[PDB]
Write a protein that binds this ligand. Structure first.
Ligand SMILES: *[C@@H]1O[C@H](CO)[C@@H](O[C@@H]2O[C@H](CO)[C@@H](O[C@@H]3O[C@H](CO[C@H]4O[C@H](CO[C@H]5O[C@H](CO)[C@@H](O)[C@H](O)[C@@H]5O[C@H]5O[C@H](CO)[C@@H](O)[C@H](O)[C@@H]5O)[C@@H](O)[C@H](O)[C@@H]4O)[C@@H](O)[C@H](O[C@H]4O[C@H](CO)[C@@H](O)[C@H](O)[C@@H]4O)[C@@H]3O)[C@H](O)[C@H]2NC(C)=O)[C@H](O)[C@H]1NC(C)=O
Ligand SMILES: *[C@@H]1O[C@H](CO)[C@@H](O[C@@H]2O[C@H](CO)[C@@H](O[C@@H]3O[C@H](CO[C@H]4O[C@H](CO[C@H]5O[C@H](CO)[C@@H](O)[C@H](O)[C@@H]5O)[C@@H](O)[C@H](O[C@H]5O[C@H](CO)[C@@H](O)[C@H](O)[C@@H]5O)[C@@H]4O)[C@@H](O)[C@H](O)[C@@H]3O)[C@H](O)[C@H]2NC(C)=O)[C@H](O)[C@H]1NC(C)=O
Ligand SMILES: OC[C@H]1O[C@H](O)[C@@H](O)[C@@H](O)[C@@H]1O
Ligand SMILES: [Ca+2]
Length: 340
């Protein structure tokens, strides 16, 4: 195919806003989580339209100031994670011990339009919950990645000591949660890429936990058992490398095991043998048209499965992480005909 892939803008939010992650509903609508100015889920209805309707689903202020990740559990139910944050500044740290997991339930006829929302569990001993992925064989349970500052504080943040990365399981029926994998440098950051996270987005495919690390360039996978624990010898495997700040990723389209991952102001495709290609954004003729991509997911309707919907949070190409211009957006990239 010709690169860069075709792309179009679906929607911009206001200056100061930040769209952080995305889940596509069985009906094809997009659900996106925001981190600023508030922790909300917005829906983009019928996103294949030139001008789709964009509507607030729910502001989770009762429990949190920001949302981070979203992931589907059982059909048309979703878990979001979030916490309180010291400010809406782009560099604000979270407030320690305030993380939570909450549920949006669109299942059933009463909830199909307006979901039922609830608090699932508080996570006061987590550091920063990030990505959410259901166990494919038991979708009422999710894994949740967890990494950022060990001692987050009000600005100015001075002690940037990172907590070691870890992965939680959460039973959304009972609310029970525990750490299932921790203490591996593949989960960690040493700020090789500047202040950032180690493990960031996660997905689960067959019996493999996959994740990207935002500091060391690697996409990893780990063999897991039925409860989410590493099968011994519990050693992560590098599946791909690129010297870029990853954020989140997906497999697709449909059944393909290509990884489509967001990196630094650019979008990448990664073959299962580790070949990485820049398909959109910086490093293509797109240049700076999509600054700050944060996550991506393929369409689910019969007529847009090859469309990769991409969330992002910058209105201009950032260089200094301390002087960025946040602006949430969602774009759509047509991957039709891409192959290695
Ligand atoms: C992955 O690897 C990690 C690292 O090993 C594992 O985590 C450890 O798990 C241990 C076992 O569960 C935990 O041990 C328990 O600790 C409890 C107290 O935890 C509280 O305090 C600690 C220490 O806080 C000090 O140090 C911090 C780090 O330097 C610092 O940020 C903090 O401010 C504190 O500093 C002050 O104090 C130190 C002296 O310690 C001074 O040096 C310093 O200057 C300051 O004045 C903290 O890390 C933790 O967050 C928490 O706040 C104890 O209460 C437990 O004791 C009970 O149980 C014991 C049996 O285990 C028993 O003997 C005892 O009688 C009690 O009944 C217990 O010792 C440990 O906290 C974890 N450490 C870390 C760093 O997280 C982890 O489990 C591994 N993961 C997996 C999945 O395997
Ligand atoms: C949402 O936030 C927006 C910021 O992200 C904000 O838009 C900004 O508004 C301010 C004031 O309203 C404008 O400030 C004015 O800038 C002009 C000069 O503008 C020209 O130069 C600037 C800076 O150029 C240098 O820096 C850039 C990167 O920083 C380099 O690439 C470059 O090489 C230079 O060294 C540049 O940002 C401008 O670009 C915009 O405008 C042109 C058309 O004029 C477009 O082609 C371009 O794509 C872009 O839209 C421009 O070339 C100066 O003379 C004035 O004194 C004043 O300082 C900002 O330019 C503007 N920035 C952007 C990116 O739009 C929105 O107003 C805000 N919205 C709301 C509702 O608040
Ligand atoms: O687990 C309780 C406590 O022990 C360890 C540190 O990681 C803390 O951030 C955490 O809250
Ligand atoms: Ca992320």
């Amino acid at each position: 195919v010709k690169l860069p892939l075709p792309q179009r803008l679906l929607h911009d939010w206001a200056n100061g806003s930040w769209v952080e992650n995305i889940s596509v509903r069985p009906n094809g609508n997009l659900l996106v989580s925001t981190s600023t100015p508030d922790g909300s889920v917005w829906q983009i209805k019928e996103p294949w339209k030139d001008q789709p309707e964009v509507e607030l689903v729910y502001n989770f202020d009762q429990w949190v100031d920001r949302l981070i990740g979203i992931g589907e559990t059982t059909p048309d139910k979703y878990v979001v994670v979030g916490s309180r944050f010291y400010s809406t500044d782009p560099m604000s740290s979270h407030v320690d011990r305030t993380f939570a997991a909450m549920e949006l339930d669109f299942s059933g006829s009463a909830n199909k339009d307006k979901p039922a929302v609830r608090l699932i569990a508080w996570f006061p001993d987590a550091h920063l919950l990030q990505g959410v992925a259901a166990l494919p064989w038991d979708r009422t349970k999710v894994l949740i990645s967890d990494q950022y500052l060990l001692r987050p504080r009000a600005a100015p943040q001075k002690d940037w000591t990172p907590a070691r990365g870890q992965v939680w399981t959460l039973d959304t029926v009972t609310g029970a949660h525990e750490v299932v994998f921790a203490n591996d440098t593949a989960l960690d950051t040493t700020y090789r890429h500047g202040y950032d996270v180690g493990i960031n987005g996660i997905k689960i495919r067959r019996d493999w936990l996959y994740w990207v690390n935002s500091d060391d360039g690697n996409i990893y996978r780990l063999k897991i058992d039925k409860t989410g624990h590493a099968v011994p010898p519990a050693k992560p495997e590098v599946v791909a490398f690129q010297d870029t700040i990853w954020d989140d990723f997906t497999f697709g389209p449909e059944h393909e095991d290509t990884i489509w991952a967001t990196g630094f102001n650019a979008i990448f495709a990664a073959s299962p043998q580790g070949k990485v290609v820049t398909v959109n954004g910086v490093g293509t003729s797109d240049n700076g048209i999509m600054p700050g991509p944060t996550a991506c997911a393929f369409g689910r309707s019969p007529h847009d499965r090859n469309i990769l919907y991409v969330t992002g949070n910058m209105g201009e190409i950032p260089v200094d992480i301390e002087h960025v211009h946040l602006k949430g957006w969602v774009r759509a990239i047509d991957t039709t005909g891409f192959h290695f």
